[PDB]
């Protein structure tokens, strides 16, 4: 009784189970362990969070010259489990062309400013080392989430919570619609 559609809550076993499907559907997703010493007892070391990287973007998500942009970089995604909220979580960390980390303010350029303030936040990884990366806050605004969740009701995708990560990524695209990463890119509907 995940109730992911009713209340939007999943168990750690289901969450970790979901990654198997995500990685299978797209090889870009990989289960990662993170720091061995920071591993969770109730969470399998072999599978603590998903991650996909080296995903470039062709443009930013702001308002500049019609041909301003002219630089390509890469971003890194991560997917952890929040026991408190009991739902899938996603981080966000990028780098410049010189293989150097971007400042928090610069990182925001490739994200909706109206969202970075509330919809998103900056936090340190619970099992990964510094510097700090951007962490999304699920359940914040159920109004927009109801749309992404409503996807399951579309009538395609069975009632398997193992696909929650794929449904979740679609939501994230709305926070980073300028990054061309793999996540089904909408199916049918």
UniProtKB/Swiss-Prot annotation:
The active site is at residue 139. GO terms for biological process: autophagosome assembly; autophagy of mitochondrion; glycophagy; mitochondrial fragmentation involved in apoptotic process; negative regulation of phagocytosis; nucleophagy; protein targeting to membrane; protein transport. GO terms for cellular component: Atg12-Atg5-Atg16 complex; cytoplasm; cytosol; phagophore assembly site. It is an enzyme of class 2 (transferase). Changing residue 139 to A: Does not affect interaction with ATG12:ATG5. Impairs MAP1LC3A lipidation. Impairs MAP1LC3B lipidation. Impairs ATG3:ATG8-like proteins thioester complex formation. It comes from the Eukaryota. Keywords: Acetylation, Autophagy, Cytoplasm, Isopeptide bond, Protein transport, Transferase, Transport, Ubl conjugation, Ubl conjugation pathway. InterPro entries: Atg3/Atg10. Its main location: cytoplasm. GO terms for molecular function: Atg12 transferase activity; Atg8-family conjugating enzyme activity; Atg8-family ligase activity; enzyme binding; ubiquitin-like protein transferase activity. Cleaved by CASP8 upon death ligand binding such as tumor necrosis factor-alpha. CASP8 cleavage blocks survival-related autophagy and favors apoptosis. There is a cross-link at residue 118 (Glycyl lysine isopeptide (Lys-Gly) (interchain with G-Cter in ATG12)). The keyword Ribosomal protein does not apply. E2 conjugating enzyme that catalyzes the covalent conjugation of the C-terminal Gly of ATG8-like proteins (GABARAP, GABARAPL1, GABARAPL2 or MAP1LC3A) to the amino group of phosphatidylethanolamine (PE)-containing lipids in the membrane resulting in membrane-bound ATG8-like proteins which is one of the key steps in the development of autophagic isolation membranes during autophagosome formation. Cycles back and forth between binding to ATG7 for loading with the ATG8-like proteins and binding to E3 enzyme, composed of ATG12, ATG5 and ATG16L1 to promote ATG8-like proteins lipidation. Homdimer. Interacts with ATG7; this interaction forms an E1-E2 complex that is essential for the transfer of GABARAP thioester from ATG7 to ATG3 and disrupts interaction with the E3 enzyme complex. Interacts with ATG12; this interaction is ATG7-dependent, essential for phosphatidylethanolamine (PE)-conjugated ATG8-like proteins formation and also mediates the autoconjugation of ATG12 on ATG3. Interacts with FNBP1L. Belongs to the ATG3 family. This is Ubiquitin-like-conjugating enzyme ATG3. It comes from Homo sapiens.
């Amino acid at each position: 009784g995940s109730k992911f559609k009713e209340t939007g809550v999943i168990t750690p076993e289901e969450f970790v189970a979901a990654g198997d499907h995500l990685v299978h559907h797209c090889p870009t997703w990989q289960w990662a362990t993170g720091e061995e010493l920071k591993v969770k007892a109730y969470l399998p070391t072999g599978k603590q969070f998903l991650v996909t990287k080296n995903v470039p973007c062709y443009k930013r998500c702001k308002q500049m010259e019609e041909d301003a942009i002219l630089q390509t970089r890469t971003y890194d995604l991560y997917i952890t489990y929040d026991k408190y909220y009991q739902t899938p979580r996603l981080w966000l960390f990028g780098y410049d062309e010189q293989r150097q980390p971007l400042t928090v303010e610069h990182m925001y350029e490739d994200i909706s400013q109206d969202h970075v303030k509330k919809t998103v936040t900056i936090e340190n990884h619970p099992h990964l080392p510094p510097p700090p990366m951007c962490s999304v806050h699920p359940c914040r605004h159920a109004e927009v989430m109801k749309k992404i969740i409503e996807t399951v009701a579309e009538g395609g995708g069975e009632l398997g919570v193992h696909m929650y990560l794929l449904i979740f990524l679609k939501f994230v695209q709305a926070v980073i619609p300028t990054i061309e990463y793999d996540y089904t890119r909408h199916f049918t509907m």
